[PDB]
Design an enzyme around this catalytic site. Structure first.
Site, short mmCIF file in Angstrom:
data_model
loop_
_atom_site.label_atom_id
_atom_site.label_comp_id
_atom_site.label_asym_id
_atom_site.label_seq_id
_atom_site.Cartn_x
_atom_site.Cartn_y
_atom_site.Cartn_z
N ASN A 180 0.84 -1.19 0.00
CA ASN A 180 0.00 0.00 0.00
C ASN A 180 0.88 1.25 0.00
O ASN A 180 1.42 1.64 1.04
CB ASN A 180 -0.93 0.00 1.21
CG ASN A 180 -2.04 1.03 1.11
OD1 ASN A 180 -2.03 1.88 0.21
ND2 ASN A 180 -2.99 0.97 2.03
N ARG B 281 -1.31 -1.82 -6.42
CA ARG B 281 -2.44 -0.96 -6.74
C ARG B 281 -2.01 0.18 -7.65
O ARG B 281 -1.12 0.96 -7.31
CB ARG B 281 -3.05 -0.42 -5.45
CG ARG B 281 -4.26 0.47 -5.65
CD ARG B 281 -4.90 0.83 -4.31
NE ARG B 281 -6.16 1.55 -4.48
CZ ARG B 281 -6.27 2.87 -4.48
NH1 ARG B 281 -5.20 3.63 -4.30
NH2 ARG B 281 -7.46 3.44 -4.64
N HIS C 8 -12.19 4.79 -8.20
CA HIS C 8 -12.68 3.97 -7.09
C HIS C 8 -13.23 2.63 -7.59
O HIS C 8 -14.06 2.00 -6.93
CB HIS C 8 -13.75 4.70 -6.28
CG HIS C 8 -13.32 6.04 -5.77
ND1 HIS C 8 -14.17 7.13 -5.72
CD2 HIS C 8 -12.13 6.48 -5.29
CE1 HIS C 8 -13.53 8.17 -5.23
NE2 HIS C 8 -12.29 7.80 -4.96
N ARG D 153 -12.10 19.07 -3.03
CA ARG D 153 -12.38 19.26 -4.45
C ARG D 153 -13.73 19.93 -4.65
O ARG D 153 -14.61 19.84 -3.80
CB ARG D 153 -12.34 17.92 -5.19
CG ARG D 153 -10.94 17.36 -5.38
CD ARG D 153 -10.99 15.89 -5.76
NE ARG D 153 -9.70 15.23 -5.55
CZ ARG D 153 -9.52 13.92 -5.53
NH1 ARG D 153 -10.56 13.11 -5.70
NH2 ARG D 153 -8.31 13.41 -5.34
N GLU E 122 -9.00 -1.21 2.26
CA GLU E 122 -8.05 -1.11 1.15
C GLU E 122 -7.31 -2.41 0.81
O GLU E 122 -7.19 -2.76 -0.36
CB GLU E 122 -7.03 -0.02 1.43
CG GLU E 122 -7.58 1.39 1.46
CD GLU E 122 -6.49 2.44 1.47
OE1 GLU E 122 -6.16 2.97 0.38
OE2 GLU E 122 -5.96 2.74 2.56
#
Lengths: 383, 391
Positions: free
Chosen positions: B7, B84, B171, B231, B377
């Protein structure tokens, strides 16, 4: 008493004179020429190239020469900014605030304001009013007007929303047919040029698809509508600010995707005829319907329901395929359309296209610009 | 069989090792004790307790190597390595077992996400070298959305920009993990699902028809869609253009990405929980925090409404990630907006759920069902590996 209504267009200026909801005289400007309709005859007059306030002046002159007495003049002003919360009879304070609204819509406001100024000067004994397209949306709350950006940009770019007169006229015309005072209505102003949707609760605007500018929201004839915000930024890095603005406003929407026409009818024709551009035309139709349906759905959740879906304007009132495609995607919400009635309707009158048993009603409702401006005159003066 | 999951973080690299859905070893690089009169170190958690190896400040691939070395020295044998990758671009419609072609294609995706893509890439390259007899896979966050049709990926702009700026969606790994976990609980293959990834960083919604992404909230960039922590989400397209004129290109990008959303409106925090706290304690910034919450909820509600019409209905609304699982006020606010569509929420279950496990918050009589679904995750990347290797 008589009411003169001015309708300012891109390359034209039309007028109509009303006496008790009846048309006395009418005509328009733009070899350029002015055409008049009086006493049942048609008078065409050659002209040199005119601007708007010149055309207005000449129209007034023709009216005076024929003894067409005028007590009222109605005007349309698109973007009335943060000041104008309602339409207004024209005084010195209104004129001042209008002039401050000029940079808000450099394409619409200046020529509109020009006609107003010349009209006040040439008819100083008449009462004149300005119908303001952004005013109807003054009932929209802060949270619905606010984009998730920090100050000072937050207050600089509040949502305004447009086509407010069209929506207000349509709502008013539905007051004998439905109970607007207890209703949730989604109106779709599908026209050439700008198109928008509005969520209306109990007769009042709650939210709309346009934003700070007339570019936001639905896919339009030549405008992109809502897109990924980083895209205008990336394009600017390629071709600069003004070129991007031109592309997003004049070379996008139905035109940019169909690669055929800005007119939905031409697009439908090419698909159904097959067709060398059908592929791109089919894509343009699908993207358009998607964004429209997505807009309807979003607004339905904001207002907490839906009793009546209304189509208006040219596209809304003359293209049955759009209404059919939309109602198909909204069928699961309880929309049972009558396809015999839908396929024949051109919206010359208020007409329901939904079975009376349908949970959500669908209707079509005319919004003739002249009748719209005139209607506001009634509200302001009672005539 | 043991599976090593990497990760990649911002200041450090973390890892976990799984054996039959359970953690046997885990660690974090570049650790600091404020009272430990000491150096930075990798902290290893192995069976019993804590093992600290003092290290210089390490980048990601350096940490990766030393992690792999530690596992060898402590006899943790590794059969699979999971990685990932945030943005796989046009090529990756599926997550993939890593070969020479995959590595070549991953390399071309670096400019897509200069920060995250190269970090994950560097770790992948060093990992293939130190464990070259070990099967490795890359879970691509954009792949799940490969099923989205052209009309849904296309913005109403002309060529050549239209093809340069197709929608991707993100996602993806979280979504397909949640969907997969729901197959033990609902008939996914005959379902219309709207999932809400309400995260601490990015946030998005996904319309899912029969297990597949139909449409999604983000677009070409990770800025589009929902109001987020920092955002702006979807705004009037003319706004960035006008802001460029005021402050220039790069400043606008920073403002909309790092100084907007919840942070920009509340003028307090990027964290929703601090915002709610300020409102309820009537702090000095209550009005702006209330506005931020209202704007955030409005955009989320509108996004769900739009996706519902696109997919043709709604059977199950699911909340996931940090805010979706652990902030009941958001779920309540949404469900009240949508009560008219047939959502009957058990308010007592909702106020007590922290989403530690899949549990319905609506009454079973309720027409539309609402649930929270965990998306840790590591399990997400691990699950992609079960799918690829059948471990």
């Amino acid at each position: 008493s008589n009411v003169l209504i001015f309708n300012v267009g891109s390359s034209s200026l039309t007028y109509k004179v009303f006496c008790s909801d009846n048309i006395v005289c009418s005509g328009k400007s733009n070899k350029p020429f002015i055409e008049h309709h009086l006493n049942g005859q048609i008078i065409k007059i050659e002209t040199p190239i005119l601007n708007h306030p010149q055309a207005a002046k000449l129209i007034i002159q023709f009216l005076k020469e024929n003894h067409i007495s005028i007590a009222f003049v109605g005007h349309r002003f698109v973007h009335g900014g943060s000041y104008f919360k309602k339409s207004a009879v024209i005084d010195e304070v209104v004129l001042k605030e209008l002039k401050e609204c000029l940079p808000l819509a450099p394409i619409h406001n200046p020529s509109s304001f020009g006609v107003i100024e010349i009209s006040m000067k040439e008819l100083p004994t008449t009462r004149q009013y300005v119908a303001i397209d952004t005013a109807f949306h003054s009932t929209i709350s802060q949270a619905e007007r606010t984009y998730a950006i920090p100050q000072p940009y937050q207050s600089q770019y509040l949502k305004f929303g447009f086509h407010g007169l069209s929506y207000e006229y349509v709502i008013n015309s539905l007051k004998n047919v439905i109970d607007v005072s207890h209703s949730k209505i989604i109106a779709c102003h599908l026209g050439t040029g700008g198109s928008s949707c509005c969520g209306i609760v109990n007769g009042k605007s709650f939210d709309t698809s346009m934003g700070n500018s007339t570019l936001a929201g639905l896919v339009m004839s030549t405008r992109c509508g809502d897109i990924d915000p980083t895209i205008p930024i990336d394009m600017i890095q390629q071709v600069g600010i003004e070129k991007v603005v031109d592309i997003l406003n004049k070379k996008s929407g139905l035109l940019g995707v169909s690669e055929l026409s800005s007119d939905m009818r031409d697009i439908l024709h090419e698909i159904e005829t097959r067709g060398p551009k059908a592929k791109t035309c089919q894509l343009a139709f699908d993207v358009y319907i998607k964004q429209l349906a997505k807009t309807i759905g979003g607004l339905m959740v904001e207002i907490g329901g839906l009793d009546l879906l209304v189509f208006t304007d040219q596209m809304g009132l003359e293209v049955w395929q759009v209404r059919k495609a939309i109602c198909d995607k909204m069928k699961f919400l309880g929309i049972e359309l009558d396809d015999s009635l839908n396929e024949k309707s051109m919206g010359k009158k208020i007409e329901f296209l939904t079975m009376p048993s349908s949970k959500v009603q669908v209707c079509v409702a005319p919004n003739d610009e002249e009748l719209v401006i005139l209607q506001k005159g009634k509200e302001l003066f009672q005539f």
